[PDB]
């Protein structure tokens, strides 16, 4: 429209209908010029990397992008409480995105003194990758999200991507992408941008914990009509061999026949937060579970979903097998345990093997009169028919969706870090300040212009997501576990601003409070 | 229109139909003042040329001009590969040119 | 029809439409009598096999069968190049089979 | 249809309408199996060739093809006389082709004794290359035409083709063609084949000779108003220099201004049929005009059209510059002049330079008081604006059409051997006996079958061509030259059968008898 008109309004609320929740978030952003308007080849060579496991090849772009892919972008802590205490499930449905009130600014420096002024004719350009033709970086859990607290102003992160490498080198199959080779909308102050998106059908996240365990599903009062082998010897001494059979029943539940078995396992090393209980060695990398791809070792960072500890063992956690969030102000490198927050998957204990335990035991031989029966431990167990499992829980600090990789086959493509896997996730939204040349020379020169006006932009972003709810139908008589604030006096309010103005999230909050039968 | 409105959008893609290819290229340009707004007689004398084979007479203008007359203006290397591997022939048909978002 | 009429024509080409390829292959075959018109029990015993991993039991028939189940049956090397350089994917859709000009 | 019915009738006549001639020719053919049903790589290595100028790479095919591309296929000698004496021009219009009364036969040999029997269920397969997707060999002047005499039974020639080579080797750009990869019609006895073809617009062949020469086009009674430089010196002695100018007129015709000049020239070496007049050396190849392509030398066999000798010099002929036909029964290699027939282009003497002469003279310097005027001979002259020329004459023994090569550019693409150049000439008609296996073994073997029943086919071919005529409009008072038979007694009739049954063509017959003004 024009210089003097606002191109959009602040809309931050949430709206609870019967089976639907509509979250709306507005934030203020700032976009720098990245890479001096250049595309740059980057690799572990350009960054000085060494180990082959860390080698990479790729490109950094002048562009930047929006990430709303964490839940605290869309939910206040109160809204999150309201979701998790009342609902068995939820999934995203629709998306609405807006860019408005764009302001492009010019920075001039004289001597040690900078002046900022509006550049009214400068433009910002924006496009969504709707055909998913770019490397999709939103499914890796990155910084640069919209801030959880609506009054914070955030920097837009720089877009970059990786392609195939051999060491620091690239192969011929490596692909380079110019983001200028897409059509994009150009925006002066007074222009706005919007688009809508439909989430594809995704199952409801399970926001409940089971009130039954998979090995306890029997009627405790009644025998089975099945028999098991109770006794193989008639007693001490030579040549005592029998087959004795007993009814499996209430008194021996471990031996009863069952129709369903716990889900798959890939075993994690167990680490105690009580520190003297740990070995006196460096096992962090060496003792870690990992998978290998093309000679590279990638740590298996989230487990396949697994229970983080056994009952009462809460001090234990799987080495890499859980999500670790930092507290507010926690540094980058080598921080103590009290400065991070270790998620635990304890609720899926009912259907899922413990991350730090063997799946079970198998027979390793044929017994005989000569040979005793031998068993061995199953350290990793793939899918078996009859397995049943829960996915990893999702968190207010955590990711929402991932892009399912485009491949011939996948199994149960729920993202291992948690959330909703999608073949066509919310598309990437790319934004860039268009370069404005400084004064060119008065004689022609064929070289590309390397001299530009120093410039940055700011504005507002609205994200509106419609969420579908699955209500609790339970007949449970006794009251349930719910997420609560604690009444006891404290210097600060949890999930509130500091005395210095710093918003913090004191604890990770999962979704699983309400219960269901198994 | 106005100071605060963009007068055009960035369109750079290529579009492959059955017997047609449509290339679109968007670039950012800068235009200096040339010749201090003057027309100037120029010759090999003004440039110091000597040999008769190189002698010339003409004019330089304050104006400047657009040249999209090379193929890499319209074709990405991948698009060029896609053209040359699959086709016995090609020719240009239509042209559309735009100037927009002018900033003085 | 009759002794003096051809019951079919040779059709070997390939046809590239926009999203479809139609391959057609014609070959000349010869069919012997197998097993002297007999069904025969066969096993690794009848062939002299030994190891249990190789043991088998079955039947050989007087019949014979057609196998077009390799790609070079339907694609010339040039057609294969044309498929693999230009396309992210392909799948079979329809099939048409003919036997004609039989000569006993 | 059936075994007992004829699938077509013999139609050999010609039909003269007002401006149209329709020729119809029927012949009997025999088709062997070629290459034992195999495609074979062939090269100068496989044939033992040596010189790089003769090196080639290609394939021979089991297929064979029809060639009606000579005029004696469609015209009796009387019809040819009737064409050339009455018409200024003619061109082909339509084509109709038929294969019918196919007979496939089986050959069995016992000991030194062969038995031929019908194989009623065997088939012949036929297709036209209508999209011109095969190497086109009909535009090279080859044996294997339909015989000029309708009672002769002819063998179908074997189809083969060449692709790119380096020496005897092939490069990656070389292309291989399987003729089985085309659709073709299969024919038992009782099946027939036909197709129609439209000639594209081609200019009329010029069946006239000019009654004027390009340098005589002036009015002999009247002066020009132009002047020429008659005299550059005033006389003998020193310092005699003048410019004298005269009117060009009837008495000096060589110097008059003219609007049009003779056509282009590429000079041929002159050879006398009076043999003692020739040099005593081997000049056949060494003294020959040639063009070079990729390091190979190809003799320039037909000239660009040029006059074969000057007036009264008929004993002279251009080395390669004319078409040479063999007489009946003339051998393959090193035959005397009396056993061949040397065509002469003498009629185009009016507009075309003599093949064995220089085109003319050009100035090679600047004359001056110090330097005399110098000229040099033009041995080859390309097209100049204002040039005018006739194409090579066409012959009853000669070719009709050629395929214009498919290229970015060509100039005046009249075939140099004569006839009608066409971008889409009459298509190639390919024919093959379909292989019939002998008895296969009773155990399966994956090898292709190399054992076949010995087999060949015969039948009839009809070719019908409609020809458009251009009548003579001339106002010439005196009678003209016409082609005639000579009345004088001879042992044989010309263009008739021998006492042994051998048809022969005693002389080459061109088209140019009638005259036109220039
Ligand atoms: O390969 C050895 C290294 O492996 C890395 O992945 C690990 O983070 C480092 O601590 C080091 O142990
Ligand atoms: O290169 C020398 C040879 O060239 C051939 O083209 C010619 O026919 C031979 O006679 C021989 O002279």
Is D7 in contact with D26 (CB distance < 8 Å)?
no
B10–A189: do the CB atoms touch at under 8 Å?
Answer: no
Is A165 in contact with A57 (CB distance < 8 Å)?
yes
Compute how many other C-beta atoms are within 10 angstroms of the C-beta atom of residue A358: 15
Q: Is the CB of D129 under 6 A from ligand 2?
A: no
Compute how many other C-beta atoms are within 10 angstroms of the C-beta atom of residue B32: 13
Compute how many other C-beta atoms are within 10 angstroms of the C-beta atom of residue D438: 11
CA distances, A293 to each of A285, A334, A429 (Å) = 17, 27, 30
Chain A contact partners (≥3 CB pairs within 8 A): B
DSSP D37: G
Residue in A177, A183, A430, A453 to test binding to B, most B beta-carbons within 10 Å? A183
Strand partners of residue A271:
A317
Q: What determination technique applies here?
A: cryo-EM
Strand partners of residue C16:
C21
- The three-state DSSP-derived secondary structure of D329-398 is CCCCCCCCHHHEEECCCHHHHHCCCECCCCCEEEECCCCCCCCCCCEEEECEECCCCCEECCCCCCCCCC
CA A136–ligand 1 middle distance (angstroms)? 27
* β-strand pairing of D114-118 with D158-163: unpaired
CA D18, D20, D21, D24: dihedral to nearest 10 degrees?
A: -130
DSSP A79: H
Residue D29 makes CB contacts below 8 A (sequence gap 6+) with D66, D153, D154, D155, D156, D458, D459, D460, D461
Contacts A121 to B, Cβ<8 Å: 3, 101, 103
Residue A286 makes CB contacts below 8 A (sequence gap 6+) with none
Residue A193 makes CB contacts below 8 A (sequence gap 6+) with A98, A99, A100, A126, A185, A187
Determine the Cα–Cα distance for residues A268 and A300; give it in Å rounded to an integer: 9
DSSP A44: H
C and D touching (3 or more beta-carbon pairs closer than 8 Å): yes
Contacts A191 to B, Cβ<8 Å: 4-6
Environment class of A463 (CB within 10 Å of its CB; exposed 0-12, middle 13-18, buried 19+): buried
* Sign of the four-CA dihedral D344, D347, D351, D356: positive
Strand partners of residue D65:
D430
DSSP string, A267-319: PPPEEESSGGGS-SS--TTTT--EEEETTEEEE--S-SS-BSS-TT-TTEEES
Query: If interface means Cβ-Cβ distance under 8 Å, which residues of chain A face chain B?
Result: 1-3, 120-123, 125, 178, 180-191, 434-437, 439-442, 449
H/E stretch holding A380 reads strand A380-381
Architecture of domain D1-518: Beta Complex (2.170)
* β-strand pairing of A208-210 with A514-516: parallel
CA distances, D424 to each of A53, D132, D183, D232 (Å) = 63, 8, 20, 57
Contacts C32 to D, Cβ<8 Å: 439-442
Strand partners of residue D324:
D342
Alpha-helical regions (H) of C17-76: 44-47, 71-74
Query: If interface means Cβ-Cβ distance under 8 Å, which residues of chain B face chain C?
Result: 18, 85-86
- The three-state DSSP-derived secondary structure of D247-277 is ECECCECCCCCCCCEECCEECCCEEECCHHH
Diameter of chain A measured on Cα atoms: 109
Is D480 in contact with D513 (CB distance < 8 Å)?
yes
- A286: tokens are 């060496």
CA distances, D174 to each of A296, A306, D47, D59, D133 (Å) = 44, 62, 19, 11, 15
Compute how many other C-beta atoms are within 10 angstroms of the C-beta atom of residue D476: 12
DSSP string, A160-192: EEEE--BTTB--TT-----GGGS-BEEE-BTB-
Determine the Cα–Cα distance for residues B73 and D448; give it in Å rounded to an integer: 54
Identify the three-state secondary structure at position D432: strand
Determine the Cα–Cα distance for residues B72 and B14; give it in Å rounded to an integer: 13
Phi, psi of D219, rounded to the nearest 5 degrees: -75, 115
- A273: tokens are 């937060």
Chain C contact partners (≥3 CB pairs within 8 A): B, D
* Sign of the four-CA dihedral A347, A351, A355, A356: positive
Contacts B18 to C, Cβ<8 Å: 18
Residue in A418, A400, A499 with CA at minimum distance from that of residue A199 = A400
- A75: tokens are 């939910």
Contacts C18 to B, Cβ<8 Å: 18
CA distances, D180 to each of C11, C76, D138, D156, D258 (Å) = 8, 12, 20, 18, 59
Compute how many other C-beta atoms are within 10 angstroms of the C-beta atom of residue A104: 23
Strand (E) positions, A110-237?
114-118, 124-129, 153-155, 158-163, 185-187, 193-198, 205-206, 208-210, 227-231
Contacts by C59-64, CB closer than 8 A, 24 or more apart: C60/C34, C60/C35, C61/C34, C61/C35, C62/C33, C62/C34, C62/C35, C62/C36, C62/C37, C62/C38, C63/C34, C64/C31, C64/C32, C64/C34
CA D49–ligand 2 middle distance (angstroms)? 12
Is A144 in contact with A157 (CB distance < 8 Å)?
yes
Query: If interface means Cβ-Cβ distance under 8 Å, which residues of chain C face chain D?
Result: 2-6, 8-13, 24, 26, 28, 30-34, 36, 76, 101, 103
Determine the Cα–Cα distance for residues A298 and A169; give it in Å rounded to an integer: 19
Determine the Cα–Cα distance for residues D308 and D314; give it in Å rounded to an integer: 8
Residue in D385, D399, D382, D442 with CA at minimum distance from that of residue D205 = D399
CA D284–ligand 2 middle distance (angstroms)? 8
Is A30 in contact with A156 (CB distance < 8 Å)?
yes
What angle is formed at CA A87 by the lines to CA A86 and CA A92, rounded to 5 degrees? 130
Counting ligand 2 atoms within 8 A of each CB, the residue from D285, D287, D293 with the most, and so the one to mutate, is D285
- For residue D314, the Cα-to-chain-centroid distance in whole angstroms is 22
Alpha-helical regions (H) of D39-163: 44-47, 71-74, 77-86
Please name the residue that has the structure tokens 């000639």. Answer: D199
The backbone region for D90, taken as left when phi is positive above 0, alpha when psi lies in -120 to 50, beta otherwise, is beta
Q: Is the CB of D287 under 6 A from ligand 2?
A: no
- C93: tokens are 């859709």
Identify the three-state secondary structure at position C78: helix
Is D27 in contact with D97 (CB distance < 8 Å)?
no
DSSP A150: T
CA distances, D405 to each of D69, D128, D421 (Å) = 17, 19, 9
Residue A405 makes CB contacts below 8 A (sequence gap 6+) with none
How many CA atoms are closer than 13 Å to the CA of D25, on its beta-carbon side? 28
Is D14 in contact with C14 (CB distance < 8 Å)?
no
Determine the Cα–Cα distance for residues C21 and C90; give it in Å rounded to an integer: 9
* β-strand pairing of D387-388 with D261-262: parallel
The backbone region for A329, taken as left when phi is positive above 0, alpha when psi lies in -120 to 50, beta otherwise, is left
Q: Which residue owns the Cα nearest ligand 2 atom 11?
A: D285
Ligand nearest to the CA of A50: 1
Residue D499 makes CB contacts below 8 A (sequence gap 6+) with D492
Is A126 in contact with A102 (CB distance < 8 Å)?
no
Phi, psi of B41, rounded to the nearest 5 degrees: -60, 130
CA A279–ligand 1 middle distance (angstroms)? 18
Determine the Cα–Cα distance for residues B89 and D408; give it in Å rounded to an integer: 11
H/E stretch holding B86 reads helix B77-86
How many CA atoms are closer than 13 Å to the CA of D406, on its beta-carbon side? 10
Determine the Cα–Cα distance for residues D298 and C88; give it in Å rounded to an integer: 48
Compute how many other C-beta atoms are within 10 angstroms of the C-beta atom of residue A415: 22
Residues with CB under 6 Å of ligand 1 are A 51, 53, 285
CA D39–ligand 1 middle distance (angstroms)? 63
Residue in B8, B10, B37 to test binding to A, most A beta-carbons within 10 Å? B10
Residue in D363, D267, D371, D269 with CA at minimum distance from that of residue D316 = D269
Buried b (16+ CB within 10 A) or exposed e, A239-262: eeeeeeeeebbeeeeeebeeeebb
């Amino acid at each position: 429209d024009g210089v003097g008109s606002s191109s959009g309004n602040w809309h931050c609320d949430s709206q609870w209908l019967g089976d639907r929740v509509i979250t709306t978030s507005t934030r203020t952003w700032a976009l720098p010029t990245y890479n001096n308007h250049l595309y740059k080849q980057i690799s572990n060579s350009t960054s000085g990397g060494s180990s082959n496991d860390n080698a990479y090849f790729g490109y950094s772009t002048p562009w930047g992008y929006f990430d709303f892919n964490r839940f605290h972008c869309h939910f206040s802590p109160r809204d999150w409480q309201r979701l998790i205490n009342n609902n068995w499930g939820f999934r995203p449905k629709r998306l609405n995105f807006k860019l408005f009130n764009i302001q492009v600014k010019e920075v001039t420096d004289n001597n040690g003194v900078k002046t900022i002024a509006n550049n009214l004719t400068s433009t910002v350009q924006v496009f969504t990758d709707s055909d998913y033709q770019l490397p999709y970086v939103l499914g890796s859990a990155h910084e640069g999200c919209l801030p959880p607290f609506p009054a914070d102003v955030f920097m837009i992160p720089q877009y970059g991507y990786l392609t195939l490498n051999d060491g620091s080198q690239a192969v011929g199959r490596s692909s380079f992408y110019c983001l200028e080779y897409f059509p994009s909308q150009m925006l002066r102050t007074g222009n706005n941008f919007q688009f809508s998106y439909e989430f594809e059908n995704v199952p409801f996240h399970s926001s409940y914990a089971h009130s039954q365990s998979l090995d306890r599903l029997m009627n405790p009062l009644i025998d089975q009509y099945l028999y098991y082998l109770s006794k193989t010897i008639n007693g001490s001494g030579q040549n005592q061999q029998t087959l004795k059979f007993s009814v499996a029943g209430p008194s021996n539940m471990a031996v009863q026949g069952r129709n369903y078995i716990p889900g798959p396992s890939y075993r994690q090393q167990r680490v105690s937060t009580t520190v003297t209980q740990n070995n006196n060695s460096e096992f962090a990398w060496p003792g870690a579970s990992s998978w290998a791809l093309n000679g590279r070792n990638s740590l298996m960072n989230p487990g396949p979903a697994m229970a983080s500890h056994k009952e009462g063992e809460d001090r234990f956690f799987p080495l890499s097998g859980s999500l670790i969030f930092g507290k507010q102000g926690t540094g980058r490198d080598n921080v103590d345990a009290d400065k991070v927050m270790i998620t635990n998957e304890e609720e899926i204990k009912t259907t899922n093997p413990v991350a730090t335990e063997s799946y079970g035991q198998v027979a390793t031989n044929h017994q005989s009169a000569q040979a005793q029966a031998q068993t061995g431990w199953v350290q990793n167990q793939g899918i078996l028919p009859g397995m049943v499992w829960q996915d990893r829980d999702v968190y207010l600090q955590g990711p929402i969706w991932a892009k399912i990789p485009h491949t011939d086959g996948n199994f149960h493509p729920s993202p291992l870090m948690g959330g909703f896997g999608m073949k066509h996730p919310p598309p990437q939204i790319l934004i860039k300040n268009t370069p404005v040349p400084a004064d060119p020379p008065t004689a022609f020169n064929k070289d590309k212009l390397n001299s530009f006006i120093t410039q940055y932009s700011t504005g507002q972003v609205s994200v509106e997501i419609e969420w579908e709810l699955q209500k609790e139908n339970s007949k449970r008589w006794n009251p349930e576990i719910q997420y609560t604030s604690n009444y006891y006096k404290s210097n600060n309010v949890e999930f509130a601003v500091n005395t210095e103005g710093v918003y913090s999230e004191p604890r990770p909050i999962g979704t699983r409070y309400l219960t269901r039968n198994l």
